[PDB]
């Protein structure tokens, strides 16, 4: 059997105590779904977190540079994952974000993972700003 579905969403703050930390951050996404179906392939996931940073448009592009595949997207606010290959196995990706300006908004984060189709099947998770804080300075 079973299986359902599985999702993977994490980050790599390195530490929450340094500036470089806040300056730049890293995110990790993974999708793992199984079913009994035959099929197919591909994996699609979407994540939405703190949207209070400034990711790199090109950075994500780097993922695409991976072998001309696996592709992911970042809408500055939210991020998406799209890969095809599968077979069997799960997939993961990595990204980076930057902050610049502060703002003020505090809110939680959510994440969702799907695989095709239908019904049922998918996984969903939640996240929060990790470490948030600010201050700064300036």
Curated annotation (Swiss-Prot):
It is found in: Secreted. Glycans are attached at residue 88. The chain holds residues 1337 to 1474 of 1474 of the full protein. Homotetramer; disulfide-linked. This is Alpha-2-macroglobulin. Disulfide bonds join 16-131. The lineage of its organism: Eukaryota, Metazoa, Chordata, Craniata, Vertebrata. Is able to inhibit all four classes of proteinases by a unique 'trapping' mechanism. This protein has a peptide stretch, called the 'bait region' which contains specific cleavage sites for different proteinases. When a proteinase cleaves the bait region, a conformational change is induced in the protein which traps the proteinase. The entrapped enzyme remains active against low molecular weight substrates (activity against high molecular weight substrates is greatly reduced). Secreted in plasma. Belongs to the protease inhibitor I39 (alpha-2-macroglobulin) family.
């Amino acid at each position: 059997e079973e299986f359902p579905f599985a999702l993977g969403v994490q980050t790599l703050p390195q530490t929450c105590d340094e500036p470089k930390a806040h300056t730049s951050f890293q995110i990790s996404l993974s999708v793992s779904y199984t079913g009994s179906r035959s099929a197919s392939n591909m994996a699609i996931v979407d994540v939405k977190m703190v949207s209070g940073f400034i990711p790199l448009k090109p950075t994500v592009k780097m993922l695409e540079r991976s072998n001309h595949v696996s592709r992911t997207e970042v809408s500055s606010n939210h991020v998406l994952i799209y890969l095809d290959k599968v077979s069997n196995q799960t997939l993961s990706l990595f990204f980076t974000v930057l902050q610049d300006v502060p703002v003020r908004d505090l809110k939680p984060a959510i994440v969702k993972v799907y695989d095709y189709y239908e019904t049922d099947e998918f996984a969903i998770a939640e996240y929060n700003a990790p470490c948030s804080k600010d201050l700064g300075n300036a």
